[PDB]
């Protein structure tokens, strides 16, 4: 029990990573349809699809908080959970399980209310793989990118994507 005199919480570093909200009556997450700022961010150990033409299929999020509101100012690391098997054989194909890349989030299944009032429920959770320089490993994107992707933080992602909502 550290410190011995006045024991404190051992989650001090976790508090710097999580985005929490006290579940009082004035502070609530709720569903995404209540308005802007009412969607619960993705926690850790969340599976996302990988829609770029890479060997990876599913990723698992490492971040304690992941959402579209702060997809421009926060980095989202993830681990390749499932990798496509090529029975008959570049950098995008060399994706091996367990590896850690960054992910650009494209869409979510949870309700997302824009500031204009347009709610959206996409088909499945979506993301694309990137390196530490924010350059996507794939050459094409097989899904739709969200409006939050339109930011200078995702320049190459916007260039490689072909459809936005």
């Amino acid at each position: 029990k550290l410190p011995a005199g006045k024991p404190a919480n051992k989650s001090w570093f976790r508090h710097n990573l999580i985005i929490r909200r006290k579940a009082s009556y004035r502070s609530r997450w709720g569903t995404g349809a209540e308005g802007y700022g009412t969607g619960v961010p993705f926690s850790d150990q969340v599976k996302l699809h990988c829609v770029d033409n890479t060997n990876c299929k599913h990723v698992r999020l490492i971040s304690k908080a992941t959402a579209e509101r702060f997809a421009h100012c926060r980095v989202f690391p993830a681990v390749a959970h499932r990798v496509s098997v090529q029975r008959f054989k570049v950098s995008r194909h060399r994706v091996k399980p367990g590896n850690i890349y960054w992910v650009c989030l494209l869409s979510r299944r949870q309700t997302n209310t824009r500031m204009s009032g347009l709610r959206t429920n996409f088909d499945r959770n979506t993301c694309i793989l990137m390196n530490d320089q924010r350059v996507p490993l794939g050459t094409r994107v097989m899904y739709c990118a969200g409006r939050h992707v339109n930011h200078k933080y995702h320049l190459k992602a916007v260039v490689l994507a072909n459809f936005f909502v």
């Binding site: 004035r26 609530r28 709720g30 209540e34 308005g35 802007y36 700022g37 009412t38 209310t113 500031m115």
Partner: protein, 142 residues
Amino acid sequence: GRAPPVIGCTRKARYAGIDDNPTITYKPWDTTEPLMADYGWTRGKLPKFRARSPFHRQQIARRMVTEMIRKDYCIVGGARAPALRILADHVVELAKAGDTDSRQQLAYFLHDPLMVDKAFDEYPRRFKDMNAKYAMMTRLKS
């Protein structure tokens, strides 16, 4: 646009008014139709008298309405009286409507088909010249 300071349907006090804020709220069933109202302590619902369950409460309400239609009056106690008066109004509304669906609904609700027939025979001609409030409730001093 943003969300209200308190999001979601939050149970307020018994005498607190409405909020009139955008809130996704669903009703259990269509309570606008007669004899299908819900019981609660808000103003949009009938005052729920004490019962072991909603099923037991509905059974008490059914026997209350049956005896009311039977002998034209009923001496009740507590929160049962407003519910009985409103359900008697609903019965008179169904009788004045006089549809086959109204007959079948009053038969589903009541315990006595003879009382269903008596209601549909008497109440239309009885309250043809009345708009609403067909039942009178008097609080006794005993």
